[PDB]
């Protein structure tokens, strides 16, 4: 792999390291400054002895050109750590910014889901599944609040479909070859990416998550809700929401992964297609962004205990 950058020169040579902006067990995101131009960037630093970042980086190299995918700017490998330099996101988490907008509308929500689902329809069509589309991994690059500034930002769990050979495959070229039940697994992962977008949508419309009330909810109870197939689309915050939007929600959160909408079908839904008939007036939402952040972290911690 030309992703063998161990031979060139120094990250610390060309950038000034600033503060952490995110932390995990085998990687860290810090903010940084390109010494020569004084321009700001983010840099995920990845421990090579703990994880192999090759698939993330390749995916970023091939698809980072997408207007709604985080854009890779540089990358180093001093041997022990890979330094992945990107554009720095100045708009914060998308869902959080939206929840703190008292007058957010259905029309806005549809444009947001369009932009995001368009992006995942493209990834899926190129054989990529994200596997971890939580709302905290979707950010705004600036504070304009335009859909154009949405970025999906972490591909640390993303998977590119391959044949046994180790050769890259698109869902379209299904001739080979390396297709043993791996078929169904990719098919299920893309369905989980859609589910995650259903969760995002639910929460945008009403200001709460469908399967968790706060960070204190036990993982067992969240899983029971998730597996019950049942969730409320009535009353309170749901009264003021169109029936077209509730319909789309039911189909993106459909408990049956085989009945769950595809990205392609999501974009053919009237709530996405006839945006121009969607109301621009206020939605009636709960106002508890921090509680939601907790419930969201709870929902994914409960799902990701194994993975």
Compute the least distance from the CB of residue 144 to ligand 0JH, in Å. 16
Q: What is the dihedral of CA 126, 130, 164, 181, to 10 degrees?
A: -100
> Is 44 annotated as ligand-binding?
yes
> Is 22 annotated as ligand-binding?
yes
Residue 71 binding Na ion, by CB under 5 A: yes
The CA distance from 182 to 272, in Å, is 31
Catalytic residue among 96, 132, 154, 189: 132
Binding piece for ligand 0JH, criterion CB under 6 A, among 84-92, 119-127, 253-261, 299-307? 84-92
Q: Which residues pair with 168 in a beta bridge?
A: 162
| x-marked contacts with ligand 0JH along 140-159 as a string, rule CB under 6 A | -------------xx-x---
Residue 291 binding ligand 0JH, by CB under 6 A: no
Beta strands in the chain (DSSP E): 15-23, 27-34, 39-47, 72-77, 81-87, 128-129, 138-140, 150-152, 159-160
> Is 199 annotated as ligand-binding?
no
The CA distance from 205 to 183, in Å, is 34
Is-catalytic flag, 142? no
The CA distance from 53 to 50, in Å, is 10
Residue 23 binding ligand 0JH, by CB under 6 A: yes
| Per-residue tokens: 96 | 């959080």
Q: With contact defined as beta carbons under 8 Å apart, do 188 and 202 qualify? A: no
> Is 25 annotated as ligand-binding?
yes
Q: Which of 84, 261, 263, 291 binds ligand 0JH (CB under 6 A)?
A: 84
The residue number with the shortest CB distance to Na ion is: 71
Compute the least distance from the CB of residue 244 to ligand 0JH, in Å. 32
Q: Which residues pair with 77 in a beta bridge?
A: 82
**CA dist 63 → 77, 244, 245 (Å):** 21, 32, 30
192-231 residues near Na ion, rule: CB under 5 A: none
Picked from ligand 0JH, Na ion, none, the partner binding residue 69 (CB below 5 to 8 A depending on kind) is Na ion
> Is 29 annotated as ligand-binding?
yes
Catalytic site residues?
132
The residues binding ligand 0JH (CB under 6 A) are: 21-24, 27-29, 42, 44, 60, 70, 84, 86-89, 137, 153-154, 156
């Amino acid at each position: 792999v030309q992703q063998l950058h161990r031979n060139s020169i120094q990250f610390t040579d060309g950038y000034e390291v600033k503060e952490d902006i995110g932390v995990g067990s085998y990687s860290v995101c810090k903010r940084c400054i390109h010494k020569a131009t004084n321009m700001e960037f983010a840099v995920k630093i990845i421990d090579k002895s703990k994880r192999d970042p090759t698939e993330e980086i390749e995916i970023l190299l091939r698809y980072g050109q997408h207007p709604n995918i985080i854009t890779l700017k540089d990358v180093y490998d001093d041997g022990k750590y890979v330094y992945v330099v990107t554009e720095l996101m100045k708009g914060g988490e998308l869902l959080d910014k939206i929840l703190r907008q008292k007058f957010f509308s259905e029309r806005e929500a549809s444009a947001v889901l369009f932009t995001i689902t368009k992006t995942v329809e493209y990834l899926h069509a190129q054989g990529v599944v994200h596997r971890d589309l939580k709302p905290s991994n979707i950010l705004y690059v600036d504070e304009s609040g335009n859909p154009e500034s949405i970025r999906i930002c972490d591909f640390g769990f993303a998977k590119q479909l391959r044949a046994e050979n180790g050769l890259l495959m698109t869902p379209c070229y299904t001739a080979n070859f390396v297709a043993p039940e791996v078929l169904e697994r990719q098919g299920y992962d893309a369905a989980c990416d859609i589910w995650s977008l259903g969760v995002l949508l639910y929460t945008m419309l009403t200001g709460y998550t469908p399967f968790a009330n706060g960070p204190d909810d036990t993982p067992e109870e969240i899983l029971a809700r998730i597996g019950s197939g049942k969730f409320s689309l009535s009353g309170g915050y749901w009264n003021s929401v169109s029936d077209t939007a509730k319909d789309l929600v039911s189909k993106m959160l459909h408990v049956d992964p085989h009945q769950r909408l595809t990205a392609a079908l999501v974009l053919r839904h009237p709530w996405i297609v006839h945006w121009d008939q969607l109301p621009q007036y206020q939605l009636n939402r709960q106002d508890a962004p921090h509680l939601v952040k907790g419930a969201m972290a709870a929902t994914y911690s409960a799902l990701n205990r194994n993975q």
